[PDB]
Amino acid sequence: PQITLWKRPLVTIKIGGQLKEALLDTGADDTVIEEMSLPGRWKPKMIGGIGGFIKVRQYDQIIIEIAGHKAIGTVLVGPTPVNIIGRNLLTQIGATLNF
Amino acid sequence: PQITLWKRPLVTIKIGGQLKEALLDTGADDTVIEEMSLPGRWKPKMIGGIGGFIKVRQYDQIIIEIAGHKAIGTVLVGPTPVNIIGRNLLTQIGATLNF
Numbered sequence: 001p002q003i004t005l006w007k008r009p010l011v012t013i014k015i016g017g018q019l020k021e022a023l024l025d026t027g028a029d030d031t032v033i034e035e036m037s038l039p040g041r042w043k044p045k046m047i048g049g050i051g052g053f054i055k056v057r058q059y060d061q062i063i064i065e066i067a068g069h070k071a072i073g074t075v076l077v078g079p080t081p082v083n084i085i086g087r088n089l090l091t092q093i094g095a096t097l098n099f
Numbered sequence: 100p101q102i103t104l105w106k107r108p109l110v111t112i113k114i115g116g117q118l119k120e121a122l123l124d125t126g127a128d129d130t131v132i133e134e135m136s137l138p139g140r141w142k143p144k145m146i147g148g149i150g151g152f153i154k155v156r157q158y159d160q161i162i163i164e165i166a167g168h169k170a171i172g173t174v175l176v177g178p179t180p181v182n183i184i185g186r187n188l189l190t191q192i193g194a195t196l197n198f
């Protein structure tokens with residue numbers, strides 16, 4: 001699709017068997033999802049943004065379906081105020097910025 | 100242009116006669132730039148990001164060039180970790196997300 005930016009670019013994602021709403025976010029290096037359980041090993045990480053850093057759990061090799069497109073990669077899980085799809089998974093679905 | 104997301108989508112902007120680097124950020128409702136001087140009055144705004152909230156200075160109707168495209172609109176000034184071009188000005192330069 002072609003998504004205009006008059007409003008937040010929100011899409012439906014499926015992760016760990018759950019549907020969620022998430023923001024397609026070109027300013028995010030990494031994908032960050034609100035607290036949930038995911039299978040396998042994880043390790044602790046700090047990520048920042050406006051207002052400071054949060055502690056998250058880093059899970060690798062997680063499959064997510066993003067607006068119908070499957071992608072695999074690292075997902076960070078923690079107390080983010082919004083689910084964010086960052087560039088690590090936007091590249092895999094072939095997303096580009098055009099103007 | 101068409102900008103892929105394998106690297107941060109950084110562009111040059113021109114504001115107050117100064118060149119700066121900024122991130123094209125579809126996850127940002129608003130444009131936020133590092134402390135600098137701008138003309139006119141400002142108004143208070145609270146904005147919320149991954150770590151929490153910061154206070155910023157809201158300047159309206161500021162002239163700003165983004166990757167060679169002219170925009171005139173609201174610019175927030177405060178302690179952001181990186182200069183961010185949000186949807187308020189991405190729409191003025193005609194940006195869309197495509198996959």
Ligand SMILES: COc1ccc(S(=O)(=O)N(CC(C)C)C[C@@H](O)[C@H](Cc2ccccc2)NC(=O)O[C@H]2CO[C@H]3OC[C@H](OC)[C@H]32)cc1
Pocket residue numbers: 025026027028029030031032047048049050081082084086124125126127128129130131146147148149150180181183185
């Ligand atoms: C290391 O990997 C990551 C590191 C950092 C981030 S981030 O969330 O902190 N952020 C990085 C930016 C700030 C350098 C991604 C942003 O797109 C973030 C994504 C975002 C969106 C909403 C809530 C929280 C975070 N957006 C904002 O902080 O937007 C601010 C400014 O405009 C307002 O609109 C939305 C926010 O108002 C709520 C305000 C994500 C992944």
Ligand SMILES: [Cl-]
Pocket residue numbers: 072073074088089
């Ligand atoms: Cl990854």
Ligand SMILES: [Cl-]
Pocket residue numbers: 094103
């Ligand atoms: Cl590509």
Ligand code: NA
Pocket residue numbers: 039040041059060061062
């Ligand atoms: Na894993």
